[PDB]
Subunit: 79 residues, 7 copies
């Protein structure tokens, strides 16, 4: 219900333009290559530097393929 | 051994069929990532009586990090 | 005992989709206190066939004390 | 199975307030046997947009057998 | 009004002193949001005899939406 | 002696209560042939932490031949 | 719970903002003026939706006779 556009706007506000671009660049590489560790590593660097940004880590679930939900959760638990 | 203590408590409080229903819902959640559906099974089993409310709250150990905040809210609403 | 026996019977009679819809409606009721809305979900699922009418009646174990009399009356009218 | 699939589709297409209004009208019909009144709620909710028209027709599974002939005809005409 | 009917029934069943005690507790709840304290007055007054139990149940109309679950639970335990 | 090695590893990783819950579930499976129910106990105990995932996979030695492909699939889905 | 709130407030509002909020809390604890403390709180913590939890969690400081008004004001902002 526009969850994507709300995420993009929040990510731009919290990470700045360079960060929002880095995250989007990593997301489109994931959509092509299916490599979850590599996109989560970009995401973790950007959104777990401070605890107030952890919701952007969690909300990134909407872009994770269903077969990758379990690994996404495990990675999040470890962060 | 926090999991094994949970399963023992759930079997003792809910009985065998109830413990199984809850584990069945946990396995479906681990596959489908649908929090509302697993919480609905859990709430039916563990909020019939206040002495079982701890089992609702302690289920958090199985809840994925992206679902934890909504799980808390839901628990507060069912309990108070 | 009684909850798990109800859930097992509902899953067997309504199928897992139906049982989930019923449990979703029960959780909404536990939060919103709206008896008409939970009864309407229940009646749609459990009064399509007469052999499922016991599932309507037995749902009383989940009904709040201040709603029990209205729930009974409505159940007698449906059956 | 057909019931649960209908309820899932209705909740997804009408949203929860709409789905509730329809189910409220179904429960009134199950007690009062007034077909016009339940059809009127259904038509308001499910003919706003053409992609929801299937929900009008599929509602027949809840209609009592003596009402099925009128129900489909009226649905076709909408 | 359901309110005015409740007040009339409470005055008739509890008498004037009791109806006042209940209303004094209701006013404090509407300000302090302490459900246990108002329910304790209500339970004392309206579970003395079974014919007064409907006054316990019908008190729900004054209970805030976030407190309906605790109100139900307390009612289940008193019955 | 693959069984005894499994039981020793499970007792060390899951503790006594967990190892017992798993063996109780294994006995029920050996009698009732219900794979979903035994895997639900196993998944709860052995997929909370990734270092216990080998216990999930090695449980295949107990699975009846007609269940082996579904067992693998379910394991892959829970782990990745 | 207090120290966790102050830590969250310092991280989300910065040190000047956390101090403004504590100054407003102290004035409330002395003067019992709920509107004035809520006005400082609302300015600081409803600029962004991610800070709304700090508005809601502020209830732990609110005197019992003000609980209902605090909730209402929160709802009207959120």
């Amino acid at each position: 219900q526009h969850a994507v556009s709300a995420y993009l706007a929040d990510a731009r506000r919290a990470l700045g333009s360079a960060g929002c671009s880095q995250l989007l660049a990593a997301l489109t590489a994931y959509k092509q290559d299916d490599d979850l560790d590599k996109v989560l590593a970009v995401l973790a660097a950007l959104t777990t530097a401070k605890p107030e940004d952890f919701p952007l880590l969690h909300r990134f679930s909407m872009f994770v393929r269903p077969h990758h939900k379990q690994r996404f959760s495990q990675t999040c638990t470890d962060l």
